[PDB]
Amino acid sequence: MEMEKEFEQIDKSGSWAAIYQDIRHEASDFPSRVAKLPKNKNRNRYRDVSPFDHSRIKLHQEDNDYINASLIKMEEAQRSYILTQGPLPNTVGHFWEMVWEQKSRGVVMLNRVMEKGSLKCAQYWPQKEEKEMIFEDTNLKLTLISEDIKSYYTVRQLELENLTTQETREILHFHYTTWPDFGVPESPASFLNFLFKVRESGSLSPEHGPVVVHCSAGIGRSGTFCLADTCLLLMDKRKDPSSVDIKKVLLEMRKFRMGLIQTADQLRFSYLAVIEGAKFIM
Numbered sequence: 087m088e089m090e091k092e093f094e095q096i097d098k099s100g101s102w103a104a105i106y107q108d109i110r111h112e113a114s115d116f117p118s119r120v121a122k123l124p125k126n127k128n129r130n131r132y133r134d135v136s137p138f139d140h141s142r143i144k145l146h147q148e149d150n151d152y153i154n155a156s157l158i159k160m161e162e163a164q165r166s167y168i169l170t171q172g173p174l175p176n177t178v179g180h181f182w183e184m185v186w187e188q189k190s191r192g193v194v195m196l197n198r199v200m201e202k203g204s205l206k207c208a209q210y211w212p213q214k215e216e217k218e219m220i221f222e223d224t225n226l227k228l229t230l231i232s233e234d235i236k237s238y239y240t241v242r243q244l245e246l247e248n249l250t251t252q253e254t255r256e257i258l259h260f261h262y263t264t265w266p267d268f269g270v271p272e273s274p275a276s277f278l279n280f281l282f283k284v285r286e287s288g289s290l291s292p293e294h295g296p297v298v299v300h301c302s303a304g305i306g307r308s309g310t311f312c313l314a315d316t317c318l319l320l321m322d323k324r325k326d327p328s329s330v331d332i333k334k335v336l337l338e339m340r341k342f343r344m345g346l347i348q349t350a351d352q353l354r355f356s357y358l359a360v361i362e363g364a365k366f367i368m
């Protein structure tokens with residue numbers, strides 16, 4: 087079925103939970119043996135969210151190459167994404183090592199450091215120009231260059247220096263600051279505006295390594311972001327845009343990381359975002 091009328095048909099019939107449970111039943115199951123090794127316990131935030139072995143990002147280290155991060159490679163859309171958890175106190179150096187080694191231009195953050203009165207990820211970037219951060223375990227230096235605070239999101243320019251080689255690179259930090267502590271946003275307008283700002287920066291384009299996107303677990307809000315981006319790109323590429331099937335795209339993405347889209351409300355919100363976004367594109 088088309089999307090917008092499939093949408094109204096699920097609303098009128100109140101069957102979002104049944105649709106979402108079907109997706110959960112059909113989703114791929116692949117091994118995640120490296121994630122479960124005892125030496126990696128303090129590298130995982132949640133015991134039930136792990137990268138598959140076949141698609142995990144490897145650190146360029148011989149001691150321990152493990153990080154909780156997955157490469158989502160979308161062949162028809164010609165887009166790739168790295169989805170990862172919010173960094174932990176003992177993985178902030180690994181996080182920036184990955185950004186460096188994978189040649190990423192941008193980092194997309196969809197959570198606040200504290201939500202619901204609890205810490206959802208480490209404070210992993212500097213807040214003042216004159217107070218830079220040094221990660222001694224991976225030999226990197228990170229400096230805040232500029233910050234632009236808007237009503238729904240903040241964009242930061244950062245400098246990452248590999249202290250071994252003295253090479254430097256500019257990284258863009260796109261921080262969506264207004265996702266509610268509970269539920270999903272009422273309108274997709276600010277989320278879509280944010281997606282378009284990331285696009286306009288070059289961070290999603292083939293001349294760079296894959297964008298790094300995270301929330302707390304790296305599957306819910308993060309899944310909404312890449313699912314909406316890929317569906318909109320396919321609607322531009324194809325002769326028949328009504329052929330784009332958001333449930334099929336989501337199941338394709340779940341071949342590369344488990345659990346993408348965590349609730350039936352997130353599934354409905356993803357439909358809404360693609361529907362509204364397809365009208366603005368034209």
Ligand SMILES: COc1ccc2c(c1)OC[C@H]1CN3C(=O)CCN3[C@@H]21
Nearest residue numbers: 275278279282362363364365366367
């Ligand atoms: C309904 O709310 C929105 C918000 C943003 C946008 C929407 C609808 O339409 C599609 C794209 C096209 N676009 C740009 O190119 C810049 C921002 N907008 C995006």
